[PDB]
Design a binder for this molecule. Structure first.
Ligand code: 8Z3
Length: 138
């Protein structure tokens, strides 16, 4: 519920890897299809994420995701810490719904992220995250 908390996991589809980041308090989502489930990709993703949102802490359902020196170096540089304390199903649901409209899985993934973030439920996840962060600054 704290505005700086994110959750990061990889899920699989069509023999590819989808990295999914969830802003816990809002439900807001960012995702990329990555070539390999490696620390290098995770580190690079964290750097991008941190330059865009105020990322303070990151949770995951697989702690071994964060063991690589590349990941530790990214968290160090960006000032992130990890912690031990379903979007994957919902995302895969939406992906299946728009899948036939794109050739590439990565395209379908971004269409799914779009739909999820804008969907009204009375505000959208996209609206919630900006309100939460903005309120937290002032
Ligand atoms: C902020 C920051 C800077 C560099 C690295 C790093 C880092 C830290 C490394 C790296 C690279 C290439 C980077 C960084 O690339 C990414 C994709 C991992 C981010 C780079 O372009 O220099 N490479 S490695 C292991 O071959 O991938 C060389 C290295 C060797 C041993 C440990 C290690 F963490 C690194 C890092 O993980 C985080």
């Amino acid at each position: 519920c704290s505005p700086g908390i994110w959750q990061l996991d990889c899920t699989h589809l069509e023999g590819k890897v989808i990295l999914v980041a969830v802003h816990v308090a809002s439900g807001y989502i960012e995702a990329e299809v990555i070539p390999a489930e490696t620390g290098q990709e995770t580190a690079y993703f964290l750097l991008k994420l941190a330059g865009r949102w105020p990322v303070k802490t990151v949770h995951t359902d697989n702690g071994s995701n964060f063991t690589s020196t590349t990941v530790k170096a990214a968290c160090w540089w960006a000032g992130i810490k990890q912690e031990f304390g379903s979007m994957n199903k919902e995302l895969k649901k939406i992906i299946g719904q728009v899948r036939d409209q794109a050739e590439h899985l990565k395209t379908a993934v971004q269409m799914a992220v779009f739909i999820h973030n804008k969907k009204r439920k009375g505000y959208s996840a996209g609206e919630r995250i900006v309100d939460i962060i903005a309120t937290d600054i002032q």
